[model samples]
Target: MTLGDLWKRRLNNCTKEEFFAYRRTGILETERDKARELLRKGETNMGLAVSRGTAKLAWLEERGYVNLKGEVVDLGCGRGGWSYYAASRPAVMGVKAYTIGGKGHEAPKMVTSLGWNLIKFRAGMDVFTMQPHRADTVMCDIGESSPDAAIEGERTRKVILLMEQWKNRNPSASCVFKVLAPYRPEVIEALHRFQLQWGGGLVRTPFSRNSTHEMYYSTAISGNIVNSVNVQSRKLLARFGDQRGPIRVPEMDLGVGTR
Candidate 1:
């Protein structure tokens, strides 16, 4: 079979056992692969590409939050799949994807093969530390960095820092966040403060599994304004509290400091 045909078959027929085996070999298999496996087995979000085909991406696109007529940025863009997907369309002027892991070693090859000159992949770069560049659409998909409370808190602080930077500079720019669901009250409160400021609300994306506990938050979509901000007062208070500081949460009370 041709390489393209092999890849198609591999994606279409990647059994759980084979997936685990590929993982054992230390070969890279992205979310698309896993999502494809789930799909072929008569599971959820069928036919949706985990890269661009996610319901969250579609939701944003429908509201013109992404794939705009200008540049788009994908933070924590794993393997650059979504970046490729975004730039594949003519509506998006360009795409800048920032990711910090080796999960994206294949990204360069993919972009090069497609000869998409407008897609720039900055690998091994932390989103919080990256230099600010204006984008019409910002897609933040930093999944849980760690399960350990302390490590996750550190990551969350970075996320919060990036959020503050983007908000300060790009208030009018459309943005979306798919973030780690916080188990700690402090982490939840910390993120909620920013979410409230951004006029975003917890949203359920069709592609996400209920068990993952990751959540989607977005700037108000046009018609779904009420549904998007379904933040009941009681629920809001329960999460954010009527307190002195969401920043005062001791675990995450960190300063942006001089190195």
Candidate 2:
């Protein structure tokens, strides 16, 4: 079968409410085992990913990328697990949670009733058309939805476009992004350029399952962003025969006997 067919088939049977419960209870022993089983079968386990969301939050907080104050936007917040963790923090004044699916979790209103501020719980909203809001930090876990809702190309394209919008409109805001790693060529270039304009890199974590291709990039774009690029650097990286062509790359051979 083709890769897309296989991906859709695997996603066909996955559920979400159980994962929300796991997140709510700090991932119970039984639930952890269940998640482990899912991982063993090479399926995307929300339980494991949600549990790791907590860790990823702490990872960002510890590094000062996510202060949890002011407003925050949780884009494509499936099951709202990551938003729940962020909103639970006392420092977080408010949150805007967006999601496309509604079958997961009974809407984490419990946290909102507690000490969290739920500015908006937008269901069935498409990330591509969702109006941009001002926020101190933007937490985007794109491509988390099932394949039927969006393909990798559409997801990556949205991410690349949003990065440009965020850079222009919220240059001083911090951000935490979880996306499929070994990204597309355009995505690679976009992420590299974003890090250059902002200041952050890939953060490795034990929480990410070894079987998954997920990665997180956290950054705090300070107010002093120059928004400048070195022309010569770009030119040097450009193809020798075509300055505006794709970036240059050296020849490679993988024959066993060749050195």
Candidate 3:
């Protein structure tokens, strides 16, 4: 069930002119038939590497991502599991990936198996170059940021800066990132900075059953999708024996300001 499918439900009231105006913005919007609808339910899209796998696609139907140009940008793609999954989606037109680490590890594996043109950057890469299509999306996981010496804060800052660059490069395109836990306050603060860069969006976790993995693995979708998963996430959390839904990573602010 996508927005077009939703036409049989609520949007049936919308005229051609009314519905064609904007679009399904992100995941939760198409799922809820709510505000964000830029990414239509029947369209293809992007993803980041996390243990959640395709959890983000739970609300989507098969072929439920909008890819007019059918382009992809996988940022901080570690191990390439999600990248491979997205590439497998015939709905995708093409794929591109970027990363800063993984010289002797999983990153190299992503290239041979996934067959995506994986671009490696030691410090960072040019985000503007990643968007071959204006409608392109950058779904990513900045990998696990080190907790030592507040390295998490630096990683968060770097990720936010790059996300902002990509957002500015193509104002209309979509971008998503996975935030690992225990989320330092500074990291969440960087999340805020990223959201404020382009208004607001949504954050959620699939509530990993493993106790240590519980509060980690957050997904941030830009715009009204920001809060889109809030209500539903909490409900799902209650059922998982976690009434709190996706709680923040324990407080630790080394520098970039607290959550």
lDDT of 2 by residue, 2-110 (tens): 3323333433433464223222231112124544454457553132323335555655676675566667888877656567666656667777887776575333322
Error of 2 at 208 (Å): 1.1
Q: Which regions of candidate 2 are displaced past 4 Å?
A: 1-52, 63-65, 102-114, 117-119, 145-154, 221-259
lDDT of each: 0.51, 0.51, 0.40
Runs off by more than 4 Å, candidate 1 = 1-56, 63-69, 103-115, 145-154, 222-259
Q: Which whole-number lDDT from 0 to 100 does residue 208 have in model 1?
A: 44
- Report lDDT (Cα) of residue 194, candidate 2: 77
How far does residue 244 in candidate 2 sit from its true spot (Å)? 48
Each candidate: RMSD to true structure? 16.7, 16.3, 17.9
Tens digit of per-residue lDDT, candidate 1, span 1-259: 2222222234335466543333223211223455446534754322234343233565556665543446888888765546655665556788888887765333332323131467787777778777777887777777663334456545655666676688777877677766553433444566667666776555544344322334455665322323332332123223221222112111110111111
Structural similarity to truth (TM-score) of each candidate: 0.57, 0.58, 0.48
When 1 and 3 are scored with lDDT, the better candidate is 1
